[PDB]
Enzyme design. Structure first.
Site, PDB file in Angstrom:
ATOM      1  N   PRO A 162       0.887  -1.176   0.000  1.00 19.54           N
ATOM      2  CA  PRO A 162       0.000   0.000   0.000  1.00 19.54           C
ATOM      3  C   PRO A 162       0.921   1.220   0.000  1.00 19.54           C
ATOM      4  O   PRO A 162       1.801   1.313   0.866  1.00 19.54           O
ATOM      5  CB  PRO A 162      -0.729  -0.094   1.337  1.00 19.54           C
ATOM      6  CG  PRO A 162      -0.517  -1.486   1.795  1.00 19.54           C
ATOM      7  CD  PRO A 162       0.813  -1.893   1.279  1.00 19.54           C
ATOM      8  N   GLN A 198      -7.011  -0.717   0.636  1.00 17.65           N
ATOM      9  CA  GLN A 198      -6.644  -0.541   2.040  1.00 17.65           C
ATOM     10  C   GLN A 198      -7.567   0.535   2.611  1.00 17.65           C
ATOM     11  O   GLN A 198      -7.601   1.662   2.100  1.00 17.65           O
ATOM     12  CB  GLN A 198      -5.173  -0.099   2.211  1.00 17.65           C
ATOM     13  CG  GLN A 198      -4.707  -0.164   3.690  1.00 17.65           C
ATOM     14  CD  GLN A 198      -3.302   0.404   3.956  1.00 17.65           C
ATOM     15  OE1 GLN A 198      -3.001   1.553   3.620  1.00 17.65           O
ATOM     16  NE2 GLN A 198      -2.443  -0.407   4.590  1.00 17.65           N
ATOM     17  N   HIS A 257      -6.327  -1.012   7.650  1.00 18.87           N
ATOM     18  CA  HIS A 257      -5.081  -0.329   8.015  1.00 18.87           C
ATOM     19  C   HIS A 257      -4.943  -0.255   9.529  1.00 18.87           C
ATOM     20  O   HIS A 257      -5.379   0.704  10.161  1.00 18.87           O
ATOM     21  CB  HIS A 257      -5.041   1.088   7.427  1.00 18.87           C
ATOM     22  CG  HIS A 257      -3.666   1.689   7.388  1.00 18.87           C
ATOM     23  ND1 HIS A 257      -2.705   1.415   8.338  1.00 18.87           N
ATOM     24  CD2 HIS A 257      -3.097   2.555   6.516  1.00 18.87           C
ATOM     25  CE1 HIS A 257      -1.602   2.086   8.052  1.00 18.87           C
ATOM     26  NE2 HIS A 257      -1.813   2.787   6.952  1.00 18.87           N
ATOM     27  N   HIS A 279       1.038   1.832  11.648  1.00 19.71           N
ATOM     28  CA  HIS A 279       1.670   3.145  11.663  1.00 19.71           C
ATOM     29  C   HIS A 279       1.087   4.308  12.454  1.00 19.71           C
ATOM     30  O   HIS A 279       1.146   5.464  12.016  1.00 19.71           O
ATOM     31  CB  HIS A 279       1.878   3.557  10.206  1.00 19.71           C
ATOM     32  CG  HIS A 279       2.622   2.532   9.411  1.00 19.71           C
ATOM     33  ND1 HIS A 279       2.216   2.115   8.162  1.00 19.71           N
ATOM     34  CD2 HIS A 279       3.733   1.814   9.704  1.00 19.71           C
ATOM     35  CE1 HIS A 279       3.043   1.182   7.721  1.00 19.71           C
ATOM     36  NE2 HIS A 279       3.971   0.980   8.639  1.00 19.71           N
ATOM     37  N   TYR A 307      -1.953   5.161  13.043  1.00 16.52           N
ATOM     38  CA  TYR A 307      -3.215   5.749  12.617  1.00 16.52           C
ATOM     39  C   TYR A 307      -4.326   5.299  13.585  1.00 16.52           C
ATOM     40  O   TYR A 307      -4.018   4.675  14.606  1.00 16.52           O
ATOM     41  CB  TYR A 307      -3.461   5.426  11.139  1.00 16.52           C
ATOM     42  CG  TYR A 307      -2.457   6.182  10.286  1.00 16.52           C
ATOM     43  CD1 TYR A 307      -2.347   7.575  10.394  1.00 16.52           C
ATOM     44  CD2 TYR A 307      -1.551   5.520   9.454  1.00 16.52           C
ATOM     45  CE1 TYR A 307      -1.359   8.292   9.706  1.00 16.52           C
ATOM     46  CE2 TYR A 307      -0.550   6.243   8.753  1.00 16.52           C
ATOM     47  CZ  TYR A 307      -0.471   7.629   8.899  1.00 16.52           C
ATOM     48  OH  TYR A 307       0.502   8.358   8.256  1.00 16.52           O
ATOM     49  N   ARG A 338      -3.519  -5.203   8.232  1.00 17.38           N
ATOM     50  CA  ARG A 338      -2.097  -4.898   8.335  1.00 17.38           C
ATOM     51  C   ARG A 338      -1.794  -4.287   9.688  1.00 17.38           C
ATOM     52  O   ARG A 338      -2.511  -3.399  10.152  1.00 17.38           O
ATOM     53  CB  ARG A 338      -1.654  -3.924   7.234  1.00 17.38           C
ATOM     54  CG  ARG A 338      -0.129  -3.704   7.203  1.00 17.38           C
ATOM     55  CD  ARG A 338       0.322  -2.733   6.115  1.00 17.38           C
ATOM     56  NE  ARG A 338       1.551  -3.195   5.464  1.00 17.38           N
ATOM     57  CZ  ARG A 338       2.446  -2.401   4.870  1.00 17.38           C
ATOM     58  NH1 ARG A 338       2.270  -1.083   4.840  1.00 17.38           N
ATOM     59  NH2 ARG A 338       3.513  -2.928   4.286  1.00 17.38           N
ATOM     60  N   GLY A 378      11.755  -3.176   3.938  1.00 19.21           N
ATOM     61  CA  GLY A 378      13.150  -3.307   3.557  1.00 19.21           C
ATOM     62  C   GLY A 378      13.579  -4.514   2.743  1.00 19.21           C
ATOM     63  O   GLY A 378      14.770  -4.789   2.646  1.00 19.21           O
ATOM     64  N   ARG A 409       8.911   0.750  -1.958  1.00 22.24           N
ATOM     65  CA  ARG A 409       9.774   1.608  -2.762  1.00 22.24           C
ATOM     66  C   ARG A 409      10.270   1.041  -4.092  1.00 22.24           C
ATOM     67  O   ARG A 409      10.231   1.736  -5.111  1.00 22.24           O
ATOM     68  CB  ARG A 409      10.945   2.087  -1.902  1.00 22.24           C
ATOM     69  CG  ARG A 409      10.503   3.034  -0.801  1.00 22.24           C
ATOM     70  CD  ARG A 409      11.605   3.229   0.219  1.00 22.24           C
ATOM     71  NE  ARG A 409      11.858   2.000   0.963  1.00 22.24           N
ATOM     72  CZ  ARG A 409      12.839   1.848   1.845  1.00 22.24           C
ATOM     73  NH1 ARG A 409      13.666   2.855   2.096  1.00 22.24           N
ATOM     74  NH2 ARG A 409      12.992   0.694   2.479  1.00 22.24           N
TER      75      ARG A 409
HETATM   76  C1  FMN Z   1       5.851   6.743  -0.439  1.00 21.46           C
HETATM   77  C2  FMN Z   1       5.266   5.725   0.540  1.00 21.46           C
HETATM   78  C3  FMN Z   1       3.924   5.651   0.833  1.00 21.46           C
HETATM   79  C4  FMN Z   1       3.357   4.658   1.750  1.00 21.46           C
HETATM   80  N1  FMN Z   1       1.986   4.608   1.971  1.00 21.46           N
HETATM   81  C5  FMN Z   1       1.495   3.661   2.778  1.00 21.46           C
HETATM   82  C6  FMN Z   1       0.060   3.538   3.005  1.00 21.46           C
HETATM   83  O1  FMN Z   1      -0.770   4.288   2.470  1.00 21.46           O
HETATM   84  N2  FMN Z   1      -0.339   2.520   3.844  1.00 21.46           N
HETATM   85  C7  FMN Z   1       0.541   1.595   4.496  1.00 21.46           C
HETATM   86  O2  FMN Z   1       0.050   0.749   5.208  1.00 21.46           O
HETATM   87  N3  FMN Z   1       1.882   1.713   4.271  1.00 21.46           N
HETATM   88  C8  FMN Z   1       2.361   2.668   3.468  1.00 21.46           C
HETATM   89  N4  FMN Z   1       3.725   2.753   3.228  1.00 21.46           N
HETATM   90  C9  FMN Z   1       4.589   1.734   3.868  1.00 21.46           C
HETATM   91  C10 FMN Z   1       4.750   0.621   2.787  1.00 21.46           C
HETATM   92  O3  FMN Z   1       3.550  -0.120   2.526  1.00 21.46           O
HETATM   93  C11 FMN Z   1       5.824  -0.466   3.042  1.00 21.46           C
HETATM   94  O4  FMN Z   1       5.514  -1.152   4.293  1.00 21.46           O
HETATM   95  C12 FMN Z   1       7.185   0.182   3.100  1.00 21.46           C
HETATM   96  O5  FMN Z   1       7.525   0.674   1.779  1.00 21.46           O
HETATM   97  C13 FMN Z   1       8.262  -0.775   3.582  1.00 21.46           C
HETATM   98  O6  FMN Z   1       8.913  -1.471   2.508  1.00 21.46           O
HETATM   99  P1  FMN Z   1       9.919  -1.198   1.322  1.00 21.46           P
HETATM  100  O7  FMN Z   1      11.330  -1.417   1.829  1.00 21.46           O
HETATM  101  O8  FMN Z   1       9.534  -2.323   0.316  1.00 21.46           O
HETATM  102  O9  FMN Z   1       9.689   0.189   0.762  1.00 21.46           O
HETATM  103  C14 FMN Z   1       4.301   3.735   2.363  1.00 21.46           C
HETATM  104  C15 FMN Z   1       5.676   3.842   2.058  1.00 21.46           C
HETATM  105  C16 FMN Z   1       6.204   4.781   1.188  1.00 21.46           C
HETATM  106  C17 FMN Z   1       7.690   4.815   0.904  1.00 21.46           C
END
Ligand code: FMN
Ligand code: CL
Length: 358
Positions: free
Chosen positions: A26, A101, A178, A181, A183, A230, A294, A316
């Site tokens: 997400p 989500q 959700h 984080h 929220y 999540r 990560g 990412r």
């Molecule tokens: C630009 C951005 C936006 C995100 N938006 C959400 C979101 O709307 N909901 C959520 O649960 N996590 C969100 N995340 C967290 C990501 O879902 C994911 O857990 C996070 O990228 C960790 O993994 P990665 O190393 O693959 O980037 C966001 C992360 C980034 C970088």
């Protein structure tokens, strides 16, 4: 050719037959002008859709009070539901499975985002300290929240229920609650935030009551096989840490077992200090387990080989690689991502202009 890898293995999840285990995490991109899903998202999600691939959409607001950022999509009005349809259709055109989500920011808001300038709502009446906004120039201030009353809470639970229905109406295959984080849902679970003295606080069981009532309401509304949740027990994001993250996470997965969900999605702890790990949670959870945080190609395959998860969500790298699954499969080089355009508002730049493999 290249050696097959576990990440490309088909996986049965709930009522769905996935063709691989690389999941689109997400990702809030703040390009939904006026809180309405936009045309450019049709292309964005379409570019990342694969046959039998699981996509989890960006956090989608369940009601007017759940807004805490500009240009994030909602799904409480007909206009939003209709705007979501073409995006969902594009994903389905390529065989993707799409979960919406559903989200509510709780205290992570400001009265300027609220209906009639009202105060944000939360499990507590304590506000967040200022945060530097994504542009790195402006400072975000938050309004102290109004503590929801015991009898008001079921109304919020119902907002998640209705949002889930609206997602189904928009054509989504399912919804992800959700609960992470810092929220709204996480605010109730985390003991650094929830200082309530009614049935929604005072003990691990009480603090998780809100989250579990939402799961029940949503599952009963659209069917548990179309529901995921999540959580981020180890995250402190938005001043929402907990004194006993391991117990919190274990309690949640053990309690979620009886609901027979499509899956449980957990974010890895940022650091390991008993020790923070998702292994005990994976072992305690009897359903499909999604991990995120990560991961790269190597760590993703390793998680599967060590049986620490069934699915691996990428954030990412999926932002910068529309065809991430394919690249992993060919062990091809990956496009680097530009964090400076993660949250900017252009319909194309940093959103749909990351290239596919030559
Ligand atoms: C630009 C951005 C936006 C995100 N938006 C959400 C979101 O709307 N909901 C959520 O649960 N996590 C969100 N995340 C967290 C990501 O879902 C994911 O857990 C996070 O990228 C960790 O993994 P990665 O190393 O693959 O980037 C966001 C992360 C980034 C970088
Ligand atoms: Cl209280």
């Amino acid at each position: 050719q290249v050696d097959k890898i576990p990440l490309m293995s088909p996986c049965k999840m709930g009522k769905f037959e996935l063709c691989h285990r690389v999941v689109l995490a997400p990702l809030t991109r703040q390009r939904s002008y006026g809180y309405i899903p936009q045309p450019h998202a049709i292309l964005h999600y379409s570019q990342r859709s694969t046959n039998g691939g699981l996509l989890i959409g960006e956090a989608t607001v369940i009601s007017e009070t759940g807004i805490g950022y500009k240009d994030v999509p909602g799904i409480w009005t007909k206009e939003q539901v209709e705007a979501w349809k073409p995006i969902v259709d594009a994903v389905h055109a390529k065989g993707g499975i799409f979960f919406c989500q559903i989200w509510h920011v709780g205290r992570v808001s400001n009265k300027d985002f609220q209906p009639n300038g009202e105060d944000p709502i939360s499990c507590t009446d304590r506000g967040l300290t200022p945060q530097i906004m994504s542009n790195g120039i402006d400072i975000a201030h938050f309004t102290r929240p109004r503590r929801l009353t015991t009898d008001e809470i079921p109304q919020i639970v119902n907002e998640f229920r209705v949002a889930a229905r609206n997602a189904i109406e928009a054509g989504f295959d399912g919804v992800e609650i959700h609960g992470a984080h810092g929220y709204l849902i996480d605010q109730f679970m985390k003991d650094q935030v929830n200082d309530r003295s009614d049935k929604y606080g005072g003990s691990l069981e009480n603090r998780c009551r809100f989250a579990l009532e939402i799961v029940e309401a949503v599952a009963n509304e659209i069917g548990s096989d179309r529901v995921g949740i999540r959580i981020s027990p180890f995250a402190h994001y938005n001043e929402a840490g907990d004194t006993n993250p391991t117990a919190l996470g274990l309690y949640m997965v053990e309690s979620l077992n009886k609901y027979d969900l499509a899956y449980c999605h957990v974010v890895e702890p940022r650091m390991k200090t008993c020790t923070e790990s998702l292994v005990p949670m994976r072992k305690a959870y009897k359903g499909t387990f999604i991990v995120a945080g990560g991961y790269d190609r190597e760590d993703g395959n390793r998680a599967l080989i060590e049986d620490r998860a069934d699915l691996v969500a990428y954030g990412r790298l999926f932002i910068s690689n529309p065809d991430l699954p394919k690249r992993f499969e060919l062990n091809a080089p990956l496009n680097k991502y530009n964090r400076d355009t993660f949250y900017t508002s252009d319909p194309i730049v940093g959103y749909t202009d990351y290239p596919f493999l030559e």
